[PDB]
C-alpha cells in the first residue's frame, strides 16, 4: 500500500542497520539507510553532507564512491530500482 519490499542488496543494508523483516514504508527504509550511514560513519566529518561509501555495501548498492545527501538522485535511483511495491 505504502509498504514496499526492498530487493536483496538493499535489504541486507537495512538489516545491517537493525531492520527486521522484508516489508517497510519509505520512511522506514530512509531511517535505516540513514542509520546505516551514521553508525558506519560513512560521511566526511569535515563535509557532513558528503557520504563516502566506496568499498561498502552501500557503495555497491548505489554504484557510487561518494554522494551528497543534499543532492540525492543517486539515492532515489537506487530506491526506484530496489523497492518493490504492491
Ligand atoms: C551523512 O548525512 C548526515 N550527517 C549528519 N551529521 C550531523 C554527520 N546529519 C544528518 C545527515 N543526514 N542528512 C540527511 C540524512 C541524514 C542522516 C539520517 C544519514 C537523510 C538520509 C540521507 C541519505 C540516506 C541514504 N542513502 C538516508 C537518509 N537525508 C534525507 C535525504 C532525502 Cl533526499 C530524503 N530524506 C532524507 O531523510 C538527509 O538529507
Ligand atoms: Cl532501530
From Swiss-Prot:
Organism superkingdom: Eukaryota
Subunit structure of this chain's protein: Interacts with MDM2. Interacts with TP53, TP73 and USP2. Found in a trimeric complex with USP2, MDM2 and MDM4. Interacts (phosphorylated) with YWHAG; negatively regulates MDM4 activity toward TP53.
Disease link: Bone marrow failure syndrome 6: A form of bone marrow failure syndrome, a heterogeneous group of life-threatening disorders characterized by hematopoietic defects in association with a range of variable extra-hematopoietic manifestations. BMFS6 is an autosomal dominant form characterized by intermittent neutropenia, lymphopenia, or anemia associated with hypocellular bone marrow, and increased susceptibility to cancer.
Included range, full protein: 24 to 109 of 490
Gene induction: Down-regulated by cisplatin (at protein level).
Protein family per UniProt: Belongs to the MDM2/MDM4 family.
Role description: Along with MDM2, contributes to TP53 regulation. Inhibits p53/TP53- and TP73/p73-mediated cell cycle arrest and apoptosis by binding its transcriptional activation domain. Inhibits degradation of MDM2. Can reverse MDM2-targeted degradation of TP53 while maintaining suppression of TP53 transactivation and apoptotic functions.
Protein name listed in UniProt: Protein Mdm4
Domain SWIB/MDM2: 2-85
Entry remark concerning the domains of this protein: Region I is sufficient for binding TP53 and inhibiting its G1 arrest and apoptosis functions. It also binds TP73. Region II contains most of a central acidic region and a putative C4-type zinc finger. The RING finger domain which coordinates two molecules of zinc mediates the heterooligomerization with MDM2.
Tissue/organ expression: Expressed in all tissues tested with high levels in thymus.
Processing and modification events after translation: Phosphorylated. Ubiquitinated and degraded by MDM2. Deubiquitination by USP2 on the other hand stabilizes the MDM4 protein.
Localisation: Nucleus
Amino acid at each position: 500500500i505504502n509498504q514496499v519490499r526492498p530487493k536483496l542488496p538493499l535489504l541486507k543494508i537495512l538489516h545491517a542497520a537493525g531492520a527486521q523483516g522484508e516489508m517497510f514504508t519509505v520512511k522506514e527504509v530512509m531511517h535505516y539507510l540513514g542509520q546505516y550511514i551514521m553508525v558506519k560513519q560513512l560521511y566526511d566529518q569535515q563535509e557532513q553532507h558528503m557520504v563516502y561509501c566506496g568499498g561498502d555495501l552501500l557503495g555497491e548498492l548505489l554504484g557510487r564512491q561518494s554522494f551528497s545527501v543534499k543532492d540525492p538522485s543517486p539515492l532515489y535511483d537506487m530506491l526506484r530500482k530496489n523497492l518493490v511495491t504492491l
